[PDB]
Amino acid sequence: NYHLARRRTLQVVVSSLLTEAGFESAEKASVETLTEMLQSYISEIGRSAKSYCEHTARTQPTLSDIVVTLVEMGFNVDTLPAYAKRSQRMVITXXXXXXXXXXXXXXXXXXXXXXXXXXXXXXXXXXXXXXXXXXXXXXXXXXXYQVLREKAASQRRDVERALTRFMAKTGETQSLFKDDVSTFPLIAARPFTIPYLTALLP
Amino acid sequence: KLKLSNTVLPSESMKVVAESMGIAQIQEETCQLLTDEVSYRIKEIAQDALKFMHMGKRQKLTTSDIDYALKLXXXXXXXXXXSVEQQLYYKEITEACVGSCEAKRAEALQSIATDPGLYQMLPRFSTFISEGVRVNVVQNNLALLIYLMRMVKALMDNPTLYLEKYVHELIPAVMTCIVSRQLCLRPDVDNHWALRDFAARLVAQICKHFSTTTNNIQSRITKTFTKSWVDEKTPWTTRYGSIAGLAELGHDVIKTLILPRLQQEGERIRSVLDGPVLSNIDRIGADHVQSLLLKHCAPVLAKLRPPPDNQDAYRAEFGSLGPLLCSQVVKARAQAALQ
């Protein structure tokens, strides 16, 4: 796709030479076909001079080389100064266009860790660890001794008071004040038949 | 498993092309075998240009290729989704989102927008990003706001990381950034308007991708801003964020919406302007808001109406738009003359 603009630039040169001629209208496909003919004529010059100045062992095609090329390719060069009166003096030169840029970026992690490790070659760029390598997650140490046994004993106290509240509101209840179902609802007495088998039983 | 019959041109068309030069009265089998022969040479050359481009090693065939062809029991403890490495990379991401050095800022922004295949320092990242949004909405701090909103922008342009499944804890943080009460200081509400502009711009970047489905995007955000615009006795930050979000939805959106809201919001203008005794915070706020949304709404009716009869167009727009609407129409005519 991106090649095409030079070809349409040649089409602009075609339109410039038609303007110097003075055609008001044209046939578009014929115009572009003539443009193709023009670029093939350019390349025909280039092939001719290419294989022609390889007849020297050195390369560089000079002026008289191209003179003999164009006379070989059929042109009276004597009109070339006079056509200068038409060419660079009656048609305005069009300018080229090429908009190239190199954008900026930054992705700074901090990990290389192997510059030229064992396959040593100091022409590379190690990416990171943030993409290539990986690791392992255990993520739960929690080993704070006194804090641990605080957790356990506090939880034991919780289960104490929980079962206390449960059988507090469950069974026969007698209080400390009057009507403490909220604060202190002590379980009332069972008294049962055989005390010793119960109270002396590990 | 395959049959390659001869692609043979209809010989009557070939006689039409022939007798276009005016040759003779032609029999069929002549042109039939002619199409055969030319098809042989064409398909031979077609194999040949294939041999070209299967050593030039592209599967597309140009004109130039054929031009060169014409040279003829307790369970194990868990492990997170992260690595330790990439979660520390994530911590770098976060503290560069904090980052005072704008080089570190832009580094973070590029690192967001161009780490495709990351995908796994996704939602956890974005999730208590949104939680930090809520907490700093409470803290009411514009710097964290602009950092997170440009962060969401860079999230929106990292093309591989598809938003769909993880949309629905992000967009409400954006709209909470839109709505109200971004009040660091009362003389410093100025940057918050640009924050709302940038936010509604982000919503505009959202809306072009997701409302094909379930219409949470278009229908819910439009009706949100609709009934939000209906909400009387609200601070004008709400009004600005609503109308700016509707502005970012598009030309025809505003063509629907600010067709009655032209003169209805002009009634809101001259309720504000030539209005109260003194509340200059709200006066200057709502005044520049109305001015901004006026000349930002202006290209719709500029594209809609021709720029004639500015005295009548002010009557067609409740006066207060005139001639700032007419000045914006002059600016639009200048922008058209730039073309």
Curated annotation (Swiss-Prot), chain A:
Keywords: Acetylation, Cytoplasm, Developmental protein, Differentiation, Intellectual disability, Nucleus, Phosphoprotein, Transcription, Transcription regulation. Induction: Induced with triglyceride accumulation. One of its GO terms (biological process) is DNA-templated transcription open complex formation. It is found in: Nucleus; Cytoplasm. GO terms for cellular component: nucleoplasm; nucleus; perinuclear region of cytoplasm; transcription factor TFIID complex. Residues 8-75 form the Histone-fold domain. One of its GO terms (molecular function) is RNA polymerase II general transcription initiation factor activity. The modification Phosphothreonine is found at X103. It is linked to Neurodevelopmental disorder with severe motor impairment, absent language, cerebral hypomyelination, and brain atrophy: An autosomal recessive disorder with onset soon after birth or in early infancy. Affected individuals do not show developmental progress, are unable to sit or walk, do not acquire speech, have poor visual fixation, and show poor overall growth associated with feeding problems. Additional variable features include seizures, spasticity, and joint contractures. Brain imaging shows hypomyelination, thin corpus callosum, and cerebral and cerebellar atrophy. 'Taube nuss' means 'empty nut' in German. Belongs to the TAF8 family. The TFIID basal transcription factor complex plays a major role in the initiation of RNA polymerase II (Pol II)-dependent transcription. TFIID recognizes and binds promoters with or without a TATA box via its subunit TBP, a TATA-box-binding protein, and promotes assembly of the pre-initiation complex (PIC). The TFIID complex consists of TBP and TBP-associated factors (TAFs), including TAF1, TAF2, TAF3, TAF4, TAF5, TAF6, TAF7, TAF8, TAF9, TAF10, TAF11, TAF12 and TAF13. The TFIID complex structure can be divided into 3 modules TFIID-A, TFIID-B, and TFIID-C. Ectopic expression of the histone fold domain acts as a dominant-negative mutant resulting in differentiation inhibition. Component of the TFIID basal transcription factor complex, composed of TATA-box-binding protein TBP, and a number of TBP-associated factors (TAFs), including TAF1, TAF2, TAF3, TAF4, TAF5, TAF6, TAF7, TAF8, TAF9, TAF10, TAF11, TAF12 and TAF13. Interacts with TBP, TAF1, TAF6, TAF10, TAF11 and TAF13. Component also of a small TAF complex (SMAT) containing TAF8, TAF10 and SUPT7L. Forms a heterodimer with TAF10. Interaction with TAF10 is mediated mainly via its histone fold domain while interaction with SUPT7L is via its C-terminal region. This is Transcription initiation factor TFIID subunit 8. It comes from Homo sapiens. The lineage of its organism: Eukaryota, Metazoa, Chordata, Craniata, Vertebrata. The gene is TAF8.
Curated annotation (Swiss-Prot), chain B:
It comes from Homo sapiens (Human). The modification Phosphothreonine is found at T114. GO terms for biological process: apoptotic process; DNA-templated transcription initiation; mRNA transcription by RNA polymerase II; negative regulation of cell cycle; negative regulation of cell population proliferation; positive regulation of apoptotic process; positive regulation of DNA-templated transcription; positive regulation of intrinsic apoptotic signaling pathway. It is found in: Nucleus. The gene is TAF6. Keywords: Apoptosis, Disease variant, Intellectual disability, Isopeptide bond, Methylation, Nucleus, Phosphoprotein, Transcription, Transcription regulation, Ubl conjugation. The modification Phosphotyrosine is found at Y119. Belongs to the TAF6 family. One of its GO terms (molecular function) is aryl hydrocarbon receptor binding. One of its GO terms (cellular component) is nucleus. It is linked to Alazami-Yuan syndrome: An autosomal recessive syndrome reminiscent of Cornelia de Lange syndrome and characterized by delayed psychomotor development with intellectual disability, hypotonia, microcephaly, short stature, poor speech, and dysmorphic features. The TFIID basal transcription factor complex plays a major role in the initiation of RNA polymerase II (Pol II)-dependent transcription. TFIID recognizes and binds promoters with or without a TATA box via its subunit TBP, a TATA-box-binding protein, and promotes assembly of the pre-initiation complex (PIC). The TFIID complex consists of TBP and TBP-associated factors (TAFs), including TAF1, TAF2, TAF3, TAF4, TAF5, TAF6, TAF7, TAF8, TAF9, TAF10, TAF11, TAF12 and TAF13. The TFIID complex structure can be divided into 3 modules TFIID-A, TFIID-B, and TFIID-C. The modification Phosphoserine is found at S130. This is Transcription initiation factor TFIID subunit 6. Component of the TFIID basal transcription factor complex, composed of TATA-box-binding protein TBP, and a number of TBP-associated factors (TAFs), including TAF1, TAF2, TAF3, TAF4, TAF5, TAF6, TAF7, TAF8, TAF9, TAF10, TAF11, TAF12 and TAF13. Interacts directly with TBP, TAF1/TAFII250, TAF9/TAFII31 and TAF12/TAFII20. The TAF6/TAFII70-TAF9/TAFII31 heterodimer forms an octamer complex with the TAF4B/TFII105-TAF12/TFIID20 heterodimer. It comes from the Eukaryota.
